[PDB]
Design a protein around this ligand. Structure first.
Ligand code: RM9
Ligand code: RM9
Ligand code: CL
Ligand code: MG
Ligand code: MG
Ligand code: MG
Ligand code: MG
Lengths: 242, 243
């Protein structure tokens, strides 16, 4: 089904890394990946889980809108940007775990489980703490499963309101120029080996949309920038972005 | 809610032998800034900045079902090549595709167009002329400061049209985004009556504030259209709004 393009391995090998990029051409309904096996390997979603978590929190009114302020709890954490008040936009932008842990507690494990089943999300397993299972519990999702979920969100087909989906897609906005719009979410899974980085999302063109999902070995935080860099190299190689 | 006149911004205009006005509005502080209070309050044809209210009305009335609905090219080849193809709301805004918005306006009709603009408090609310061309050569006029007042309502979902229509139009206004800011805006270019001018109106979203802007400048030929964004960006950089 998917076409394998092993030449993209060159972009990982340049940085003494390994990983997978998965692309989906929405118009043609064709998929491409450098590694058919790793494309289907399920990992902790880590902070890419902020996408379904945001959708669920909005649909249940835990988050009223993208302006609602979630005040800092006063606990100083290692990521300076977390130590301040946030709304949905900035909590996504800075991947603010304590804000989303409060969402998850308010959602509760019964509703969290039902929504992930409704979303057909990964292995639909929330075993672990209700406020950390996407970092060190049972939930597992592959890059191709991320594409599936993102396609539903793009088409407003997920089992939540249209408004919720529109707001989350606004919150995913990452980059836009006159050539393309990227809506995406990064993730860095460090609590359980193997430590991996994620980038999942899509590229909007005038006449098409390319969905992507990538993950890569990430032993130290020094390489986090390679998630976007390698993905963009693949997008350029494939003539999706100039 | 006061105003400061900062005439040092004029250096960005005179560098290009241009003249114009930039108006900024700091939402958090409710403070306005401009290089020219007189011109900030002079009203002009909106030209294609009218695509913002026009999109809202078309969406709210169901003339546009959503941002994917295709509006077909009428087969008349026009000067701007990107016009000569099918469009949706996103690409029609991006390329300022007048023929698509003229079809919107004809479907909206005079009475509904007039009612909506009054309820929006949009400029002088005057649609005199052809319903599908009054923003190019009819009676509608709007000042840069009046553009801000309208845009602030849109940002806050305070217009009387649906929240959905307001969200879709703000998505369609997306012009630039990065790790430092988001710009939602619409360009305009008006030549059918004097003075010929370029517009750029919209806002800059920061982590913790929103800066609304509305600029216009003399545009004696189309050669200077790019100065609309470049001069605005120079002012935003001078004021430390963007890096
Ligand atoms: B999560 O996966 O998001 C995250 C963390 C640390 C560093 C990062 F770059 C990212 C990210 O990808 O946004 C921790 C909090 C979680
Ligand atoms: B409108 O004012 O928009 C427009 C036109 C021509 C060239 C442009 F750059 C622009 C603009 O400002 O987007 C014509 C169609 C109208
Ligand atoms: Cl957006
Ligand atoms: Mg390289
Ligand atoms: Mg299932
Ligand atoms: Mg200059
Ligand atoms: Mg009025």
């Amino acid at each position: 089904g998917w076409q394998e393009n092993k030449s993209w391995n060159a972009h990982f090998t340049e940085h003494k890394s390994q990983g997978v990029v998965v692309l989906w051409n929405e118009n043609k309904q064709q998929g491409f990946t450098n590694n058919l096996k790793r494309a289907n390997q399920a990992f902790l979603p880590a902070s890419t889980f902020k996408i379904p978590n945001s959708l669920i929190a909005l649909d249940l009114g835990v988050v009223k809108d993208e302006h609602q302020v979630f005040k800092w709890d006063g606990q100083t954490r290692d990521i300076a940007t977390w130590n301040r008040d946030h709304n949905l936009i900035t909590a996504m932008k800075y991947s603010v775990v304590p804000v989303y842990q409060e969402f998850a507690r308010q959602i509760g494990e019964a509703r969290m489980s039902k929504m992930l089943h409704a979303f057909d999300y990964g292995n639909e397993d929330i075993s672990g703490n209700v406020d950390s299972f996407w970092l060190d519990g049972g939930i597992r999702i592959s890059a191709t499963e991320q594409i599936s979920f993102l396609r539903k969100l793009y088409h407003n087909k997920l089992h939540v309101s249209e408004r919720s989906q529109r707001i989350v897609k606004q919150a995913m906005l990452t980059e836009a120029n006159g050539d393309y719009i990227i809506r995406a979410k990064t993730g860095y899974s460090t609590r359980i080996e193997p430590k991996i980085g994620w980038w999942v999302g899509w590229v909007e063109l005038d006449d098409n949309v390319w969905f992507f999902a990538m993950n890569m070995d990430m032993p130290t935080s020094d390489g986090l920038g390679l998630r976007q860099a390698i993905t963009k190299e693949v997008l350029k190689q494939e003539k999706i972005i100039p």
